[PDB]
Design a protein around this ligand. Sequence first.
Ligand SMILES: *[C@@H]1O[C@H](CO)[C@@H](O[C@@H]2O[C@H](CO)[C@@H](O[C@@H]3O[C@H](CO[C@H]4O[C@H](CO)[C@@H](O)[C@H](O[C@H]5O[C@H](CO)[C@@H](O)[C@H](O)[C@@H]5O[C@H]5O[C@H](CO)[C@@H](O)[C@H](O)[C@@H]5O)[C@@H]4O)[C@@H](O)[C@H](O[C@H]4O[C@H](CO)[C@@H](O)[C@H](O)[C@@H]4O[C@H]4O[C@H](CO)[C@@H](O)[C@H](O)[C@@H]4O)[C@@H]3O)[C@H](O)[C@H]2NC(C)=O)[C@H](O)[C@H]1NC(C)=O
Ligand SMILES: Cc1cc(OCc2cc[nH]n2)c(C(C)(C)C)cc1Cl
Ligand SMILES: [Ca+2]
Ligand SMILES: [Ca+2]
Ligand SMILES: [Cl-]
Ligand code: NA
Ligand code: NA
Ligand SMILES: [Zn+2]
Length: 805
Amino acid sequence: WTATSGSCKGRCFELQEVGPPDCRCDNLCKSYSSCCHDFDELCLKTARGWECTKDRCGEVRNEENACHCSEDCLSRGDCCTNYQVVCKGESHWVDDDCEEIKVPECPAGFVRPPLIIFSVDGFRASYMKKGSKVMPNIEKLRSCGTHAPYMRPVYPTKTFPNLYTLATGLYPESHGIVGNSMYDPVFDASFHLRGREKFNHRWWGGQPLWITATKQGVRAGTFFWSVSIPHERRILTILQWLSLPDNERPSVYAFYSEQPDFSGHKYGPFGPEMTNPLREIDKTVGQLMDGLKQLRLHRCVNVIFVGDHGMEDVTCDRTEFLSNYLTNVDDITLVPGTLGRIRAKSINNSKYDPKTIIAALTCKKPDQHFKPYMKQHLPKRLHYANNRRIEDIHLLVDRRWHVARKPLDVYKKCFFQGDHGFDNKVNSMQTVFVGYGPTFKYRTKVPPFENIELYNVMCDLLGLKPAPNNGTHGSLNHLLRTNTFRPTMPDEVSRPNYPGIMYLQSEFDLGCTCDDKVENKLEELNKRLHTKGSTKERHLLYGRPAVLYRTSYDILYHTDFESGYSEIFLMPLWTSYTISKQAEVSSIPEHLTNCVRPDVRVSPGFSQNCLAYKNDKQMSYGFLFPPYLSSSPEAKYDAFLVTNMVPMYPAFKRVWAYFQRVLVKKYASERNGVNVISGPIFDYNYDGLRDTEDEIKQYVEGSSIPVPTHYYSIITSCLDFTQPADKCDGPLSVSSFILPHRPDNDESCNSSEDESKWVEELMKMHTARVRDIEHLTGLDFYRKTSRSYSEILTLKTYLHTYESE
Ligand SMILES: *[C@@H]1O[C@H](CO)[C@@H](O[C@@H]2O[C@H](CO)[C@@H](O[C@@H]3O[C@H](CO[C@H]4O[C@H](CO)[C@@H](O)[C@H](O[C@H]5O[C@H](CO)[C@@H](O)[C@H](O)[C@@H]5O[C@H]5O[C@H](CO)[C@@H](O)[C@H](O)[C@@H]5O)[C@@H]4O)[C@@H](O)[C@H](O[C@H]4O[C@H](CO)[C@@H](O)[C@H](O)[C@@H]4O[C@H]4O[C@H](CO)[C@@H](O)[C@H](O)[C@@H]4O)[C@@H]3O)[C@H](O)[C@H]2NC(C)=O)[C@H](O)[C@H]1NC(C)=O
Ligand SMILES: Cc1cc(OCc2cc[nH]n2)c(C(C)(C)C)cc1Cl
Ligand SMILES: [Ca+2]
Ligand SMILES: [Ca+2]
Ligand SMILES: [Cl-]
Ligand code: NA
Ligand code: NA
Ligand SMILES: [Zn+2]
């Protein structure tokens, strides 16, 4: 019940909210049917429109008008944004030359530059270049401020997941808004775009910027705008708030536009009808900037121009139908569209089997435009698994396509020409970032970054301490003129042991064999020095990784590679080696095919054993440093040490062997040497974080050898590729991956073919940031470089996407 007979007189767009049944004048009242009777009249005035005209100059105030042109309007803070231009011979902001904003130039009483987040729905990254002729205000912001060529959204590339990630710095799996439609089995409630349940507060986790601000003494304007409030009114309201007294004035504001997304759906990303929405957005920016200039705030306010996602060409005829694959189609609930999420129609149905669903949807048609996954097998870079609102079965849909349950769903709902929601690596899903103001840099381009990073920056712009989030604080320091955050490297928790030769061959009863007893004082001192770490500066280019949890491990040195060997997990946490441009691939010689050698530095009791692999009919083994890349026949023996062995399914060995035999050398040729760090990852509870030993769900049969869920590699070289990887003066270049350790290649539809036709494609799909690998291993890389720490942070958040420009 609303007692809508109270009043909005003087309370229009109240910042604080009144408890029902006192009626509301806040934005958001419209959505709840709770506005006071006089809301529209007092708060949504429209009389005479949005602009001053020559005749209105100096007029007598009329409180009915949408905005004002009377002499008193500036100190009332309610002039039309074009007031000075029309009535005082001022120029539009867009017509003024830009000038560096070296310091904030703010009116007395501002304690800090305000921040205005100007968010535009569906604003695809390429609109900045393609629409440049019709967006002169945005183009001035972009060229004069700090801009990236694009900003990476989170998956799924829908509206509320992205806007809420901007607000919190969290992956959707952690903030809880994991899609535009959701079922939460603990609440037993649903969340939809239409309607009221989405306004319930239990959907929304983490801590959004407006709460972070309020808790720390900074006042905030409201972020959500009801669809029936026109854009001009949203701007004028922000401008009114900026005129409040110092004790009441917010420091952070958001504007939101439903365009260009709304038109994008109807006409496609580049439909001729798209020019007009872009013009109108640009005009709104012009209104904000003219309004700020009138208030003398145009060299004081920091403005962020940001989209939530891009937009792709999608039509009704590009729909895959689950009814073409499944016979049981009525026993399932599909969340449909540009992604698929499948669960059982009914929890009473014990017949329903996810396994047979997956199999019925896997590689069934030659050009199949979606791929089914258990959520835990989705590429780790999507961070899309650790939430009860995400169904166990997921369909990743090809760009340009839709998935639906039955044809009747599509034509009983062709309407639309655009949609979004696909994989957040897809070029058409990329959106925009521009930062303009005293705290941002002047005329500076920065590389593309992920929207999860912005919360930290907005906290920095406001002098706030950010709530714990998924950004890497400091990785965006290069956007800022000042207010940078100067982070420190995390401290190592566990220091390594450096074992020497402590065990005799015969102490080992591991069931391992090697043809190797083939027997000089020159190269006897030689081999000892290698084992003591003589070549380490060649293979450990950026220092050893720090272990940031409590554990027991040993550093092991070798001619061709260095490793940090875990006595708890009985394998390396990491293995580091450099392959120069000149290096040679050799094969495993015949007399060494099944050779596994005891490591006399490491106790039999902290070693793997060959018998377990023989007994495990499902499990084979591979090597972290590849024998193929050994520097000499004698160094090759080191590669067969039991301490270099890891559990691998035969199907995964096809992948791994091609990466090590073919791809590493290819990358070294193309990149002028590479440094490689490889190792295992254990993420049995799919939370994106390193498992403790007691979380491991699978061991090599009859042993305590734990089975990794993934294998990673970090491949580093010189950004200036005229310098070899091991002699690099300046910035680094990196690409990484986190490959799922799977007993089959069902993910790769073309896997019956030669690895040269599918392996690299699989690796690209599972591209990763170094930071993703850090979360998953509890390791911290690049500790010893000649680069600044913020630069290394930026490097660790880099994602090689394998999309064209
Ligand atoms: C991205 O950044 C985020 C933010 O930093 C990282 O997420 C954090 O990770 C931590 C580790 O998983 C996690 O810490 C846990 O907190 C538990 C208390 O949680 C509540 O309080 C916090 C703080 O205010 C709050 O934010 C939480 O909100 C979550 O839950 C509600 C739903 O209930 C949601 O509305 C909200 O969106 C959010 O959900 C997300 O997180 C939870 C996990 O907490 C997931 O389940 C959801 O799917 C969703 O993703 C909570 O309200 C605390 O209870 C935990 O402590 C247990 O575990 C430790 C391990 O040290 C153990 O020692 C403790 O004793 C305790 O164990 C006991 O409970 C066990 C489990 O019930 C039980 O099995 C044992 O037997 C024990 O008795 C734990 O410390 C932190 O909450 C989240 N924060 C957020 C916001 O998600 C995230 O990891 C980053 N991602 C990556 C890839 O890096
Ligand atoms: C910039 C911005 C805008 C925004 O909402 C705008 C909006 C959407 C529909 N109507 N109004 C949100 C929430 C949606 C979280 C409230 C966050 C952020 Cl970070
Ligand atoms: Ca959107
Ligand atoms: Ca885990
Ligand atoms: Cl969705
Ligand atoms: Na085996
Ligand atoms: Na296959
Ligand atoms: Zn949309």
